[PDB]
Design an enzyme around this catalytic site. Structure first.
Site, short mmCIF file in Angstrom:
data_model
loop_
_atom_site.label_atom_id
_atom_site.label_comp_id
_atom_site.label_asym_id
_atom_site.label_seq_id
_atom_site.Cartn_x
_atom_site.Cartn_y
_atom_site.Cartn_z
N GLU A 136 4.50 33.50 59.76
CA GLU A 136 5.21 32.24 59.57
C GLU A 136 4.19 31.21 59.17
OE1 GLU A 136 8.02 30.72 62.58
OE2 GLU A 136 7.77 28.72 61.74
N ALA A 176 23.95 28.50 65.62
CA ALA A 176 24.37 27.99 66.92
C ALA A 176 23.17 27.62 67.78
CB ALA A 176 25.21 29.05 67.63
N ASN A 212 2.64 16.87 69.86
CA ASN A 212 3.60 17.81 70.43
C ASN A 212 5.00 17.49 69.91
OD1 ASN A 212 5.35 16.18 72.40
ND2 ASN A 212 3.29 15.63 73.09
N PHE A 239 11.70 20.41 71.98
CA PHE A 239 12.25 21.36 71.02
C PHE A 239 11.94 22.82 71.25
CE2 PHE A 239 15.01 20.11 67.60
CZ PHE A 239 15.10 18.74 67.81
N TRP A 283 19.15 19.06 64.52
CA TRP A 283 18.31 18.10 63.82
C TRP A 283 19.05 17.28 62.77
CZ3 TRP A 283 17.40 23.19 64.79
CH2 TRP A 283 17.68 24.11 63.77
N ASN A 291 15.57 25.95 73.63
CA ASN A 291 16.79 26.14 72.84
C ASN A 291 17.58 27.34 73.34
OD1 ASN A 291 14.80 25.70 69.78
ND2 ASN A 291 15.36 24.24 71.40
N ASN A 339 6.01 22.36 66.78
CA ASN A 339 7.03 23.06 66.00
C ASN A 339 6.51 23.54 64.64
OD1 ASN A 339 9.31 23.83 64.43
ND2 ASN A 339 10.64 22.37 65.50
N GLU A 387 10.19 31.55 58.14
CA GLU A 387 9.80 30.29 57.50
C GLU A 387 8.46 30.30 56.76
OE1 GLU A 387 10.34 28.09 61.29
OE2 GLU A 387 11.85 26.92 60.22
N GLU A 420 19.84 33.13 62.28
CA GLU A 420 19.78 32.09 63.30
C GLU A 420 20.97 31.18 63.09
OE1 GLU A 420 15.93 30.05 63.66
OE2 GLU A 420 15.10 31.73 62.49
O1 LIG Z 1 14.60 25.38 66.57
C1 LIG Z 1 13.75 25.42 65.42
C2 LIG Z 1 13.86 26.80 64.80
O2 LIG Z 1 13.94 26.65 63.34
C3 LIG Z 1 14.07 27.96 62.70
O3 LIG Z 1 14.14 27.79 61.29
C4 LIG Z 1 12.84 28.83 63.02
O4 LIG Z 1 12.99 30.09 62.39
C5 LIG Z 1 12.76 29.01 64.55
O5 LIG Z 1 11.61 29.81 64.90
C6 LIG Z 1 12.63 27.63 65.20
O6 LIG Z 1 11.44 26.98 64.74
O1 LIG Z 2 13.34 25.20 60.94
C1 LIG Z 2 14.19 24.32 60.23
C2 LIG Z 2 14.11 22.90 60.83
O2 LIG Z 2 13.85 22.99 62.27
C3 LIG Z 2 13.78 21.66 62.87
O3 LIG Z 2 13.54 21.79 64.28
C4 LIG Z 2 12.63 20.84 62.24
O4 LIG Z 2 12.58 19.54 62.83
C5 LIG Z 2 12.90 20.71 60.74
O5 LIG Z 2 11.85 19.95 60.12
C6 LIG Z 2 12.96 22.12 60.12
O6 LIG Z 2 11.71 22.80 60.33
MG LIG Z 3 9.14 27.20 63.03
NA NA Z 4 12.86 25.56 68.72
#
Ligand SMILES: OC[C@H]1O[C@@H](O)[C@H](O)[C@@H](O)[C@H]1O
Ligand SMILES: OC[C@H]1O[C@@H](O)[C@H](O)[C@@H](O)[C@H]1O
Ligand SMILES: [Mg+2]
Ligand code: NA
Ligand SMILES: [Mg+2]
Ligand SMILES: [Mg+2]
Ligand code: NA
Ligand code: NA
Ligand code: NA
Lengths: 1011, 204
Positions: free
Chosen positions: A404, A527, A585, A589, A987, A592, A90, A449, A525
């Site tokens: 990113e 939901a 890993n 996650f 999260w 989605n 991630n 990000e 982004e």
């Molecule tokens: O599900 C985690 C998501 O968090 C967002 O902030 C990010 O822009 C996505 O690309 C994905 O990493």
């Molecule tokens: O993208 C925003 C959030 O996405 C989650 O999946 C990740 O665990 C967080 O640490 C933060 O990155």
């Molecule tokens: Mg990311």
């Molecule tokens: Na994701």
């Protein structure tokens, strides 16, 4: 001289970016967008060999094919070919964070291709090669001699091979490095792969050629007139006899056309661009472009001589549309949009990250079919074909640069460092120069990000200068920085603030009115659709519709990023994080989506479709009021279809054609509806239907629906007392009630119904007991792992509290005889380490008619995390083929995600009562059920339920849906109350308070019997 | 109130009366109230109510029980939200505790008479020899709901024989965003359709 470890070198000898070219030598071919002889594809079988590092690549390879090599298909990702494992991480970078250095052991893919070139291509003009996508950096050699270098896995790299090719056989040597300094800007939360994953082409252009062209369309205030402006730039020998003619085509018609010689207007003290010219065509009453009606024109750019000789021609589809943010609102052709969008990664369950037309069109149809009108290229420029499709099918696109760095600390360590301004610059500018002509692209994004550094501001301003036609946005640094025209948060909740320091996520409603703020707000982004999610989705839309400046968002996300693996028997199964030996890993996650990797809808997709309808309805007695949410089209391919039904039993129905103007309303007067008689609940149900098939929809497609509780008739005529009477037998260990054929047994040692009989046939494989837990959903788990525990996650709060291991202590268990029924009274106290968590008092009443009436009354400690559910469960012995119920369906629905479900009589095969989420968890629940029928059984009341061949226990102990084994009989979970699933993000606790079983005291009643 | 059922049974240690009524109007069945009274050896009456409300009849102002007690005590003691009058949508200020006040303070002298003096979230109510236990709302005074709705000024109200007790399992909100149009928030409207409350009547 390592170039893959120097952010200052992102390319070597690469040609300039530009709109899609084909170099037609016939204007007619250009206008009709037919194949071009000057554009060959080098896709197919290539020679490939894997190496542990570039330093292991044998020189011989440059000139002579390695025999040890294999023949593989290109484009593709070598991970998908099994040459090495694809990694899923991630945030945490896949490599060691030490910019600009990468591992000495850098997986190097050696691709080679022997092909021949027509002699005519080498006798004149320019012959170049085009790599649409190489992950993540690479060196190119043509016939042993070195050509150039390139970085940025998501945009095309082009090199002029003219002086390297020879007539006949030729050989390409492409050394592709998996890691490079460019990897620092490619830290998206997706599978980390590599190789030549996008088409490879060969384009021939004349020496004197068209090197670039920009299409612009400006209108008057009422869009009655429009001026098409085409800036054209050339290369080669400049001559006066040269001319450029831009012609606009509407089908076979030629709406306008202009011709002029090169020589632009004076721009400064040194004059102007003698190698450019701008054409301006007038257009009266143009057909405007939108996702509603993708009206397109064809612009054909011809480079020719004054005497009429065509030198070459280029073209593109043109969509007359104006995008502008005015007075706080994002306007598309003067009207304020409502973005019903979704984020979409380029992912294929078998092909890795290699896209193909078929998969694209498929996704597009599904999206439009589920009322989506926009997509965000999370998080990099998409394959060139995609934009073409969105142009024609009708979809608002957010084109996002490939940047990113979420893994850095702080997040903007690179984006704020001027040393990295160059690398970033190219990932922004080259995207713009490539896609700037596509009408479907309505907004430019600076990446994802990566905090908020100066570089972002610099690049922000660049786009604004270069292309005023589109708004720029970026969520980094708090979603409302000086680098964005739109407040574009991600996962900011509707009413609840999340006051994080520096970068808080305000309630979207509160955000709009913050002192000084005036921009429009569209979540980039929201939901998080991970697993059994999308709960509370309706709340977002409720808000989008009420607030003018709350203009929508992009759901996260479209499809599950699961890859296909095979077991010993050679059977396929969905795999995720770690399933490839990849480590570290990030578990599951990467899944989605609203649909599985194979584009099969998730239950949630249906909820989305419903909430994103374009037709709103209100009922007032006999009149149905339909309001259109379209901004341009008329409801010219729709008809309302209504129907009244008494608890499933239809009575009346009909259908009125829909004639609603965009933004307009239409009143429909239902005929004097049928006067019900029998006891029950009358339900009016309307469905909007598209009689005619479209380019994206089948015939009779349903675009919207709505239900209404008409009248109700409480039954007063209580049942006719049968003369039979149940007989109570008493052991010291049991209470047995017998009535005719049926036999009931209550174990006095437990306090639960331990067994029932219909003849000499057992009915239960497991006692009928209370249940207050559930197989943790992804949203219940959050980011809590085996070694790293998140004490805040619902699952942990429950675990700690002891809900998952509560011993049911018996407080009471008596039996009494009544004038016509036996009466068993129980009372249990679930505890853990002394603490009394729940108390469940019940009374079972089996009467002459042979019906068991279970009345439950539970108590929950006002200081123990709210239970995931409050119901009963048992393992039935039977295994029927169908399931019939009167309640919310047909699909899976939960408290906070059931708007889309309708109340009626539903009948489905046992299997459809189970949702195959790759990561197993509580699923298949159906709420608001008054009658449930399975096998000989029938349960009545007002409960929720899920019925399958898997126990909650197995489900929470199993990690993949393919390791689940059917169990003896059928597990029944009947809930009087079920906690919401949540999903504002996956999260952190995301279940809205009104959906938390916190009342303290609950009460539900069930009636078990034989149908 | 039409009677649907009224039976009595004997248990191993208590009598059990089961009732079931159907309140109607011009045929339309508005409410259905099923109850079971359980008087046991300790001499405590356990009333269990389960009401149904037509999903097409304006949501009821309340869902409870009432009767005119014969006594007229000087004080009222209860464990719940107080000390002052409080309703569902206006009870934040009230605190949970043991409150004791003179019968008169359980009546709010609004110049224009109406439902008043309610106290929510009460687990124990004590009046005279009586004690009611559960999780209800209540108002207790010398004026019947009827008199209150037929009287225009607080000074034309006359004390009645005994003390009127209104025990609600559920009470609709009072509203007030404005006083010239429905102003009661949805979350405070008795619309669930099916309600359930339980009371325990006994002598303290
Ligand atoms: O599900 C985690 C998501 O968090 C967002 O902030 C990010 O822009 C996505 O690309 C994905 O990493
Ligand atoms: O993208 C925003 C959030 O996405 C989650 O999946 C990740 O665990 C967080 O640490 C933060 O990155
Ligand atoms: Mg990311
Ligand atoms: Na994701
Ligand atoms: Mg480099
Ligand atoms: Mg809705
Ligand atoms: Na809006
Ligand atoms: Na129509
Ligand atoms: Na009155």
């Amino acid at each position: 001289r390592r170039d893959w470890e120097n952010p200052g070198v992102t390319q070597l000898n690469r040609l300039a970016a530009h709109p899609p070219f084909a170099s037609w030598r016939n204007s007619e071919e250009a206008r009709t967008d037919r194949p071009s002889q000057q554009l060959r594809s080098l896709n197919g079988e290539w020679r490939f060999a894997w190496f542990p590092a570039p330093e292991a690549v044998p020189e011989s390879w440059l000139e002579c094919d390695l025999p040890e090599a294999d023949t593989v298909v290109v484009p593709s990702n070598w991970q998908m070919h099994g040459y090495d494992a694809p990694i899923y991480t991630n945030v945490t970078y896949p490599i060691t964070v030490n910019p600009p250095f990468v591992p000495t052991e850098n997986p190097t893919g050696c691709y080679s291709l022997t092909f021949n070139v027509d002699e005519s291509w080498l006798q004149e003009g320019q012959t170049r090669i085009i790599f649409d996508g190489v992950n993540s950096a690479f060196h190119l050699w043509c016939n042993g001699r070195w050509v150039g270098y390139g970085q940025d896995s998501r945009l095309p790299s082009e090199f002029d091979l003219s002086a390297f090719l020879r007539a006949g056989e030729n050989r390409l040597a492409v050394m592709v490095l998996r890691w490079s300094d460019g990897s620092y800007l490619e830290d998206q939360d997706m599978w980390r792969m590599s190789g030549i994953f996008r088409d490879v082409s060969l384009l021939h252009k004349p020496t004197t050629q068209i090197s670039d062209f920009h299409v612009a369309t400006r209108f008057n205030d009422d869009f009655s007139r429009a001026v098409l402006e085409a800036e054209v730039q050339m290369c080669g020998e400049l001559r006066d006899y040269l001319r450029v003619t831009v012609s606009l085509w509407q089908g076979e018609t030629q709406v306008a056309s202009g011709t002029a010689p090169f020589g632009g207007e004076i721009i400064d003290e040194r004059g102007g661009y003698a190698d450019r010219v701008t054409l301006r065509l007038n257009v009266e009453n143009p057909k405007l472009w939108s996702a509603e009606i993708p009206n397109l024109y064809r612009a054909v750019v011809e480079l020719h001589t004054a005497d009429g000789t065509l030198i070459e021609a280029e073209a593109c589809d043109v969509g007359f549309r104006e995008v502008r943010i005015e007075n706080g609102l994002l306007l598309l052709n003067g009207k304020p949009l409502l973005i019903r969008g979704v984020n979409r990664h380029e992912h294929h369950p078998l092909h890795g990250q290699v896209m193909d037309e078929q998969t694209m069109v498929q996704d597009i149809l599904l999206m439009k079919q589920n009322n989506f009108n926009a997509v965000r290229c999370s998080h990099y420029p998409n394959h060139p074909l995609w934009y073409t499709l969105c142009d024609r099918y009708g979809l608002y696109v957010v084109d996002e640069a490939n940047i990113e760095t979420e893994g850095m600390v702080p997040m903007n360590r690179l984006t704020d460092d001027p040393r990295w301004l160059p690398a970033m610059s190219e990932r922004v500018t080259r995207m713009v120069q490539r896609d700037r002509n596509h009408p479907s692209v309505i907004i430019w994004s600076l990446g994802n990000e990566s905090g908020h550094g100066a570089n972002h501001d610099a690049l922000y301003r660049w786009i604004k200068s270069v292309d005023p036609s589109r708004p720029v946005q970026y969520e980094g640094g708090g979603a409302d920085t000086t680098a964005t025209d739109i407040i574009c948060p991600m996962y900011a909740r509707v009413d609840e603030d999340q006051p994080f320091p520096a970068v808080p996520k305000w309630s979207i409603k509160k955000w709009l009115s913050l002192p000084g703020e005036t921009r429009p707000l569209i979540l980039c982004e929201y939901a998080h659709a991970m697993g059994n999610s999308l709960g509370g989705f309706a709340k977002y839309w409720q808000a989008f519709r009420q607030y003018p400046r709350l203009q929508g968002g992009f759901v996260w996300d479209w499809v599950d990023q699961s890859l296909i693996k095979y077991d010993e028997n050679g059977n396929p199964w969905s795999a995720y994080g770690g399933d490839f030996g990849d480590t570290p890993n990030d578990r599951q996650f990467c899944m989605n989506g609203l649909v599985f990797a194979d584009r099969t809808p998730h239950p949630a997709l249906t909820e989305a479709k419903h909430q994103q309808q374009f037709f709103q309805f209100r009922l007032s007695g006999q009149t149905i009021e339909v309001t259109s949410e379209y901004l341009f089209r008329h409801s010219d391919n729709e008809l309302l279809h209504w129907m009244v039904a008494l608890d499933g039993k239809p009575l009346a129905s009909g259908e009125v054609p829909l004639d609603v103007a965009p933004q307009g309303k239409q009143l429909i007067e239902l005929p004097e509806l049928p006067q019900p008689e029998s006891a029950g609940q009358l339900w009016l149900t309307v469905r909007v239907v598209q009689p005619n098939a479209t380019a994206w929809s089948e015939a009779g497609h349903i675009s919207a629906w709505q239900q209404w509780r008409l009248a109700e008739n409480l039954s007063v005529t209580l049942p006719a007392a049968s003369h039979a009477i149940p007989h109570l037998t008493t052991s010291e260990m049991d209470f047995c009630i017998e009535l005719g054929n049926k036999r009931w047994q209550f174990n006095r040692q437990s306090g639960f119904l331990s067994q029932m009989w219909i003849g000499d046939k057992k009915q239960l494989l497991t006692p009928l007991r209370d249940q207050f837990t559930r197989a943790p959903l992804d949203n219940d788990i959050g980011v809590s792992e085996a070694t790293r525990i998140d004490p805040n996650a619902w699952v942990e709060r429950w675990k700690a509290a002891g809900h998952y291991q509560a011993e049911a202590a018996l407080l009471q268990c008596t039996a009494d005889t009544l004038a016509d029924a036996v009466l068993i009274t129980t009372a249990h106290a679930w505890q853990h380490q002394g603490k009394t968590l729940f108390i469940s008092r019940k009374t079972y009443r089996i009467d002459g008619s042979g019906q068991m009436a279970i009345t439950v009354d539970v108590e929950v400690a006002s200081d123990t995390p709210h239970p995931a559910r409050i119901g009963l469960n048992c393992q039935l012995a039977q295994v029927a083929e169908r399931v019939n119920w009167l309640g919310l369906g047909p699909q899976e629905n939960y408290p906070d995600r059931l708007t889309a479900a309708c109340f009626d009589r539903w009948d489905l095969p046992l299997s459809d009562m189970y949702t195959p989420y790759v990561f197993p968890s509580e699923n298949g629940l159906r709420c608001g059920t008054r009658e449930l029928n399975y096998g000989p059984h029938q349960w009545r009341g007002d409960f929720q339920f899920n019925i399958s061949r898997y126990s909650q226990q197995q489900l929470m102990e199993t990690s993949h849906r393919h390791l689940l084994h059917a169990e003896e009989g059928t597990w029944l979970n009947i809930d009087g109350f079920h906690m919401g699933i949540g999903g504002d993000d996956s999260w952190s606790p995301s279940v809205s308070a009104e959906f938390q079983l916190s009342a303290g005291r609950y009460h539900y009643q069930l009636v078990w019997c034989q149908k």
